[PDB]
Amino acid sequence: DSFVIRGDEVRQIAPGQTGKIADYNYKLPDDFTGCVIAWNSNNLD
Amino acid sequence: SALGKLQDVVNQNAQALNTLVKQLSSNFGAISSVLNDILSRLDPPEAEV
C-alpha cells in the first residue's frame, strides 16, 4: 500500500492507533501488519 | 447442633458457591473488575490485555 503523509501521520499509521488519518483516512487491522516503511519525500514534492 | 455433619455439608457448599461469586468483584490486576466498564473506556487493542 502506497500513500504520502506527513511525519506525524507516520506515527499515526500503526495497528490500533487512533488519529484523524487513522480514524477515517486509513485504518490498520487489529492483527499483525507486515511492515511499515516511511521516509520523507520533500525533495520529490 | 445434633445434626452437625449434615449442617456442615450444607455450609461447605454454600461457602464454596459464595466465594465463587465473590471472586467476580475481585480486580485481578486489571484497571477495573466490572467487564463492561473496562470495555467501555479503553480501545480494543489496549482493553484486550
From Swiss-Prot, chain B:
Name of the protein this chain belongs to: Spike protein S2'
Effect of residue 39 to F: In strain: Omicron/BA.1
Function: Subunit of the fusion protein that is processed upon entry into the host cell. Mediates fusion of the virion and cellular membranes by functioning as a class I viral fusion protein. Contains a viral fusion peptide that is unmasked after S2 cleavage. This cleavage can occur at the cell membrane by host TMPRSS2 or during endocytosis by host CSTL. In either case, this triggers an extensive and irreversible conformational change that leads to fusion of the viral envelope with the cellular cytoplasmic membrane, releasing viral genomic RNA into the host cell cytoplasm.
Effect of residue 12 to H: In strain: Omicron/BA.1, Omicron/BA.2, Omicron/BA.2.12.1, Omicron/BA.2.75, Omicron/BA.4, Omicron/BA.5, Omicron/BQ.1.1, Omicron/XBB.1.5, Omicron/EG.5.1
Top-level division of the source organism's lineage: Viruses
Parts forming coiled coils: 7-49
Taxonomic lineage from the root: Viruses, Riboviria, Orthornavirae, Pisuviricota, Pisoniviricetes
